[PDB]
Ligand binder design. Structure first.
Ligand SMILES: CC(C)N1CCC(c2cc(NC(=O)c3cnn4cccnc34)n(-c3ccc(C4CC4)cc3F)n2)CC1
Length: 287
């Protein structure tokens, strides 16, 4: 590999790390991946500059991201162009993702139009191809969530944030990391397994179908994953949950996606399907 950018070049392209949103004329794009993501124009290309943002742990999150990215190059993974360590903050430089994150697009943040079911199927498929790639290369993401699934100019799914990623090639840890609302029961307990990434992708699929965030304090249920139980203990059905902000979603394909999410969300890690099966089931859904 990557370019080694100076902290000062990245200051100039990001207009001295402007915390102002894009709408007002600033450079801040969003925060939530152990830092703030800014917009910039480096080497004649539009870039995304992640300014990180224990201090020891955060430096290891930086070093792992570059480590994973160096080995891992796929069309469903975000492309890291370079980095900065020389200055007062740790910066990561990526190819700009014009359609931001899946989370933001499912909530229509900034007035973007709702994603069609057709686009939603392509995103689900692409994200599974990116997880498959990581799993085939003995990497466990540890933080699969819609905020970490980025979208390009063609709405191609691009997995990002490999700062918490772990190589294999079942282990345990004292430092439990990830997003609570997406995490597998064993992962919340300290277990490091690719089966936990499958569970997290199951929550993502429920966000795709429903357009609902994994967690909402002002909602019943507060956690999206509880809906699997509401549907099973026939209080409600999947149709009562389908995102109303779509006009092309047929029940057959939606039920087919829920079937995959349901299988992914099995509480027994050993009973969950592997990524290649998830990928296979998602391909059969379209075609
Ligand atoms: C059409 C308009 C309304 N769009 C234009 C695109 C804009 C946008 C662009 C980006 N982000 C990127 O372009 C991006 C590229 N690689 N990368 C790796 C990690 C994180 N972010 C990125 N984010 C973005 C910024 C922060 C995060 C972090 C999870 C918070 C995720 C993101 F996708 N938001 C959002 C507004």
């Amino acid at each position: 590999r990557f370019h080694s950018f100076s902290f000062y070049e990245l200051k100039n392209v990001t207009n001295n790390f402007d915390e102002r949103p894009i709408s007002v004329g600033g450079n801040k794009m969003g925060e939530g991946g152990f830092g703030v993501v800014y917009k910039g124009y480096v080497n004649n290309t539009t870039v995304a500059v992640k300014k990180l943002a224990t201090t020891e742990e955060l430096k290891q999150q930086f070093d792992q991201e570059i480590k994973v990215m160096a080995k891992c190059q796929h069309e469903n993974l975000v492309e890291l162009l370079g980095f900065s360590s020389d200055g007062d903050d740790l910066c990561l430089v990526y190819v700009y993702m014009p359609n931001g994150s899946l989370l933001d697009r499912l909530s229509c943040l900034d007035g973007t139009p709702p994603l069609s079911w057709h686009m939603r199927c392509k995103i689900a498929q692409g994200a599974a191809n990116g997880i498959n790639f990581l799993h085939e290369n003995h990497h466990i993401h540890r933080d699969i969530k819609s905020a970490n699934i980025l979208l390009d100019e063609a709405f191609t799914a691009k997995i990002s944030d490999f700062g918490l990623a772990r190589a294999s090639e079942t282990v345990m840890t004292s430092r439990i990391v990830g997003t609570t609302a997406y995490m597998a029961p064993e992962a919340l307990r300290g277990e490091i397994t690719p089966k936990s990434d499958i569970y997290s992708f199951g929550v993502v699929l429920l966000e795709i179908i429903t357009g609902l965030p994994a967690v909402d304090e002002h909602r019943e249920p507060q956690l999206l994953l509880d809906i699997k139980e509401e549907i099973e203990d026939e209080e409600k059905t999947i149709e009562d949950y389908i995102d109303k902000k779509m006009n092309d979603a047929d029940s057959t394909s939606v039920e087919a996606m829920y079937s995959v999410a349901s299988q992914c969300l099995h509480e027994k890690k050993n009973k969950r399907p592997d990524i290649k099966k998830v990928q296979q089931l998602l391909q059969e859904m379209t075609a």
